[PDB]
From a paper:
To understand the mechanism by which a fatty acid odorant with a long hydrocarbon tail reaches the ligand-binding pocket, we aimed to determine the structure of OR52cs in the apo state, without a bound ligand. The four-helical bundle fusion partner of thermostabilized apocytochrome b562 ([name]) was inserted into ICL3 of OR52cs (OR52cs-[name]). This chimeric protein, which showed neither basal activity nor OCA-induced activity, was purified in complex with a Fab recognizing [name] for the cryo-EM study. To date, only a few class A GPCR structures have been reported in the apo state, such as structures of rhodopsin and constitutively active GPR52, likely due to the structural flexibility of class A GPCRs in the absence of ligand. With a large dataset, extensive 3D classification, and local refinement of the receptor, we successfully obtained a cryo-EM map at approximately 4 Å for model building of the apo state OR52cs. The apo structure of OR52cs reveals a large opening between transmembrane helices (TMs) 5 and 6. Indeed, the distance between L2025.40 and L2626.56 reaches 14 Å in the apo state of OR52cs, compared to 6–7 Å in most class A GPCRs. In the apo state, the extracellular segment of TM6 (residues 255-266) makes only a few contacts with TM7 residues, whereas the intracellular segment of TM6 (residues 237-254) forms close contacts with residues on TM5. C2436.37 and H2466.40 form close contacts with Y2205.58, and I2506.44 interacts with I2165.54. In the middle of TM6, Y2546.48 forms hydrogen bonds with S1143.40. All-atom MD simulations of the apo state OR52cs showed considerable fluctuations in the distance between TM5 and TM6, whereas the distance between these helices remained stable in the active state.
Olfaction, or the sense of smell, is initiated by the stimulation of odorant receptors (ORs) by odorants. Here, we determined the cryo-electron microscopy structures of consensus [name] (OR52cs), a representative of the [name] family, in the ligand-free (apo) and octanoate-bound states. Several subtypes of the human [name] family, including OR52A5, OR52B2, OR52E1, OR52E8, and OR52L1, are known to recognize carboxylic acids, and the consensus [name] (OR52cs), representing 26 members of the human [name] family, is also responsive to carboxylic acid odorants.
Author numbering: 11 to 17, 19 to 52, 57 to 168, 174 to 189, 194 to 226, 996 to 1044, 1061 to 1113, 237 to 294
Amino acid sequence: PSSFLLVIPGLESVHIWISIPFCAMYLIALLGNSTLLFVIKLHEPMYYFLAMLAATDLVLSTSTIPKMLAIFWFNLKEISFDACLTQMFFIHSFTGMESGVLLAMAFDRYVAICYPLRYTTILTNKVIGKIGMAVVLRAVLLVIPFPFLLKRLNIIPHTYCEHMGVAKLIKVNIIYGLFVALLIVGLDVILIALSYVLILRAARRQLADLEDNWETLNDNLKVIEKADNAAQVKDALTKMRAAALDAQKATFRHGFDILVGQIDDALKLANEGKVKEAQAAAEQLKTTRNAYIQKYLERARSTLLKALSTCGSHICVILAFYTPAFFSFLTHRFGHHIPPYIHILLANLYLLVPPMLNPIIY
């Protein structure tokens, strides 16, 4: 054929009033993405992925709104076949890229949290570029067969060319449509969950190690205070020196050196077979312990947590982009009693509101 006659079919009476929210959302998304890209023109990998996400999102949003606005206002409902194929390919490819970018952001957050000292040496401009190129190539390759398969084989009740909607004009295309969903979207869920469980599993042992060190130094010291033999004092002081060394390594800096020096001075006296002097030195060390042990451990608990609050903003994007997808999937498989115009409005909203929400969050 030459042209397709697009048509909200139920609400065909009033159409001007429906276009106000869509125009407002498009303007907001365009302005937000433009500002986000302009502000960078912060050289960190996470910001690079955020910029790529914003650019892909803006280009996706600009590829669907104008046709709907023109249909609503000017009532020009004719689309060339080439335009329909182009719009289909662009929409699907950009959704895939957005998912890939989210996955890359999750990986960057994981490598930041679990390895804070090797974050720069692992992520290099070359490796980041290779990852981005791989994501783009995977999305393009997986989205390339759709136009060819459709071209292998005149009213659309919609506002843009959707592959599932166009295919109704059967039992084979749906298999590939389901396979691609579980390769660029289904795998993203699994990888993000695995990258979040590993992050949350990390905070648990780093804090546990410091807690263990504090408990063992305190507990052991009580034993030294209640000490009765030349051997026991030495056996406890050696463990004290080891624990202090490890705790200072794990990192209020000098204070660890002072505690270590006090432990060393106590060890020498016990080496010379004096019990009272060792007990006195141990009691003296408790002063520096209370002076620096109390303050370091107080900040230690608050310290581990701050790194988990940098990952909080990235959870909102997932919640705002995946949950609408799940709602759309549920309404596209069990939504029979609802009239079709509700289906059209819901699909438009689920496709359009992530572009609105993303720039406002970041």
